[PDB]
Write a protein that binds this ligand. Structure first.
Ligand SMILES: Cc1cc(N2CC[C@@](CO)(C3CC3)C2=O)cc(C(=O)NCc2cc(F)cc(-c3cnn(C)c3)c2)n1
Ligand SMILES: Cc1cc(N2CC[C@@](CO)(C3CC3)C2=O)cc(C(=O)NCc2cc(F)cc(-c3cnn(C)c3)c2)n1
Ligand code: PRO
Ligand code: PRO
Lengths: 480, 480
């Protein structure tokens, strides 16, 4: 049972939700968490989705070492210096990302324009060792991810690949996880180190008012090619720099799903990625033909599974049906199917959907088509409600005077911005001091993205902080 | 093109085979190798096979951290001591295996007999940092693996699980990879540290005469439960120690496949795990209807792929068909399909199988069923020939006098042994000195396994080294 209200103590609510559903187990070494089967199944499902999608683009999986030499990497990096009692001749680092691991190989592999495009991906874990306090799924020192790295003959090929991947990330969140995101370009002050242009999908956490960078797709261009001398020969003979992309996404996505859909009873997992879509709970009166009831549950299980519905029967006699109702609600199973002697006599079943609590009586013959329609019903609704909370979380503003009241309501701001970097740094330090002063009477706002969706820009619109001619609409807010 | 003979310089043959087929790329940090897509596809296929199989047993996937504290682990272990310029308050280790990472969690999770069996697995990489020289796939400082860990209420449940997993490993090698193995029990001198009984599947490398431990399945029993206080309550109330298993298998299996099936032209990959089973090579005379020929290749591709045959068309005009013949032979594609204007006019195709070089002419209508029959033909033959080379590699002996002549022929020995540990150590040190002395005129033999398949033991048979009553037949040899 979950006891903390989501709209009061969000921290303890999230901890309770992920622990009591058997998603996360704690670990000795600060910032690392055991991912238990209940959460790993979801990671497996989104990984299968993304893998299939990128294999249709020609991306292939590989595995590069987790170690990188001090030479090639040359802040939040863990160093190996000993193999037991013996010292290393030169300390080695654990990958925080693998550009400097993979790209010397790329320089060796790419000779001719007939070698491009080169498209590799890997599923692994990386280690970014910050001493700040962690957050399960969202900010951990070790995390699982995929990272893809492509090299191309032209800039425009690489850019189209960046956008195609960003679309796949939008589908990862919105399609599988029912989390709405915003496609954007990062400012030059927040873009990847060494890249040309970083795109992103941003998500939003209403309860603390914080945007979070859900995934990233970088146009590296020729910057890394220069660093690593990755060149191809054209049909003429002339050597030219390849144009590269890199893109990544992590188990952070799981956290974002949890916070988006959970409620006071606990997890609410979208049907598309639930490892159990329907849990069948037989009623088990002592004064009843139990073998018959269980036989019919088994029949309904096979009947649903032929429609590819993922079913678990909880026939444990040492727990009441109310205990099981709570137990599978806490783990977020989207549909519960109850079947007792009355239901049997009438040839129906009772189904309760996890999102709203609504109950239905369905005849066995209509069970598979009806539940299918209901699962798409739940998924869709989970998305649209979340989409509502997204749009109600963003205030469109004209002046800096409107920032602080919008932040105190846990909202983001969409403002006309001139895109000057020094202005962003100024804005962060000022909103941070204003936040501290407000805290005294009871931090910093940054750019999250310049959205692809640009609303109308009136002709003479001025920058909301500098007064200069505004260039584009920018989404700012407090951030993870 | 591969130029080193497999039966002359096996080292350079193996290196050439794995490099020239684009399986392995070298890396700065000694003992680590980049696994390129051509090899990773095979790893993906065997991983899918094993994953499916263990999910039918109820095993679930998880992910535990790659770090372990100095406390809990308390030789070939890499230590992290710094996060950049800052020192760690207590150095941490990178997993060489995860018993000491997972089992405190197990102690927390297992309370009641209704919590057993507990069956977890993970796919990750581990780091065993030896300063000896590495061997691609076979012996590397970092390797990918799966490791499974189960806890049970009784010893016999855990033992049946150990044997079931060992059977799945036999199917991993023999069924998918067409490599024959021998099921055995390891001596107490070679068994896992802290376990009760280690089982294994052993493979054999004829060209250097060396057995290699292909995979391992340990009965831990209650030893680790005592160390970590993992206890369950029975229905009576009494706390009891759980009985545990752990089992693992790695990318070593890939190496063993390569060495088993490759020839002087290079790789020979069994059809069951080839990512390309049929490469279709159109003949492309300049004086021919090329669009027609390519159209028919595309048709044959879709026709074969509806029978679930994995097909690639190599329609590159800048390479001759002979270049492509060599190129896909080197990468080990099991079937090659050639199609030109003559074949088109006759409605047939030419197919050449990679193992023997045999050619066939098949009408399009029979293409899918015939190729299917041929792929099982290749697989089967790859296995049986390898099985032959296995059995011809083992000499059954009675006396120690027969050891050295059997080792000088690169063979293993099956000998009646009393199973005394001090005898094994004696045997290793003596065969090593005899080997060194022989080398002067131009090392050590150990036990590989006590096979499950015990041949007849005559009543008064004496130990082949000590003269004592022999206990069981034991397979010895030089080893990886
Ligand atoms: C799971 C995950 C995902 C991502 N990221 C980043 C990249 C991206 C975004 O798209 C994806 C690759 C493309 C993603 O998912 C970044 C981290 C992370 O920075 N970890 C280190 C850490 C540990 C820690 F204990 C605390 C803090 C910390 C930071 N501020 N505070 C107040 C605490 C940070 N972790
Ligand atoms: C790929 C892989 C698999 C396995 N093993 C062991 C376990 C098992 C067997 O079933 C599987 C888990 C169950 C498996 O596959 C063990 C190693 C390995 O010991 N690596 C370290 C290393 C690095 C190095 F550069 C050199 C040497 C070395 C040792 N002697 N010499 C002359 C050189 C050793 N590596
Ligand atoms: O960390 C990053 O942002 C990029 C994308 C994945 C690989 N490196
Ligand atoms: O390394 C070993 O041998 C065991 C089996 C995999 C996990 N630990």
């Amino acid at each position: 049972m979950v006891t903390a209200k989501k709209d009061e103590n969000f921290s303890e609510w999230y901890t309770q939700a992920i622990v009591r559903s058997e998603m996360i187990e704690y670990y000795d070494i600060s910032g690392c968490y055991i991912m238990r089967p209940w959460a790993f199944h979801i990671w497996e499902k989104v990984q299968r989705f993304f893998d299939d999608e990128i294999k249709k683009m020609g991306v292939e999986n590989s595995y590069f070492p987790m170690f990188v030499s001090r030479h090639k990497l040359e802040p939040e990096v863990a160093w190996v210096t000993h193999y037991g009692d013996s010292p290393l001749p030169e300390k080695i680092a654990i990958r925080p990302t693998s550009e400097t691991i993979m790209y010397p190989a790329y320089a060796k592999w790419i000779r001719s324009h007939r070698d491009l495009p080169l498209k590799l991906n890997q599923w692994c874990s990386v280690v970014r060792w910050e001493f700040k306090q962690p957050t399960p799924f969202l900010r951990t020192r070790e995390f699982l991810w995929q990272e893809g790295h492509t090299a191309h003959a032209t800039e425009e090929e690489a850019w189209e690949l960046v956008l195609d991947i960003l679309e796949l990330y939008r589908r990862w969140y919105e399609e599988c996880l029912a989390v709405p995101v915003i496609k954007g370009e990062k400012s030059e002050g927040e873009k990847f180190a060494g890249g040309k242009k970083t795109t992103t999908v941003e998500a939003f956490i209403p309860e603390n008012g914080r945007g979070i960078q859900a995934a990233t797709s970088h146009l590296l261009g020729t910057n890394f090619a220069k660093m690593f001398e990755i060149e191809f020969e054209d049909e003429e003979g002339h050597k030219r720099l390849v144009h590269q992309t890199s893109w990544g996404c992590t188990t952070r996505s799981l956290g974002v799903m949890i916070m988006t859909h959970g409620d006071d009873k606990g997890l609410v997992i979208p049907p598309r990625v639930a490892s159990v879509q329907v849990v069948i709970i037989p009623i088990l009166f002592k004064d009843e033909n139990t073998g018959e009831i269980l036989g019919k549950c088994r029949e309904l299980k096979t009947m649903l599974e032929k429609a590819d519905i993922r079913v678990r029967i909880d026939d444990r006699s040492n727990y009441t049906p109310g205990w099981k109702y709570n137990h599978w609600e806490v783990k977020g199973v989207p549909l519960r199917l109850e079947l007792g002697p009355k239901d049997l006599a009438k040839g129906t079943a009772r189904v309760v959907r996890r999102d709203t609590g609504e109950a239905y009586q369905i005849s066995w013959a209509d069970l598979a088509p009806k539940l299918l329609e209901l699962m798409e019903g739940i998924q869709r609704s989970l998305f649209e409600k979340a989409k509502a909370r997204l749009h109600e979380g963003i205030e469109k503003i004209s002046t800096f005077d409107e920032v602080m009241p919008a932040l105190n309501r846990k909202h983001l701001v969409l403002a006309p911005w001139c895109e000057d970097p020094e202005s962003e740094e100024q804005i962060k330090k000022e909103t941070q001091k204003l936040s501290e002063i407000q805290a005294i009477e009871a931090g910093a706002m940054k750019t999250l993205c310049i959205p692809f969706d640009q609303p109308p820009m009136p002709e003479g619109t001025k920058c909301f902080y500098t007064g200069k001619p505004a260039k584009r609409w920018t989404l700012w807010g407090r951030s993870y």
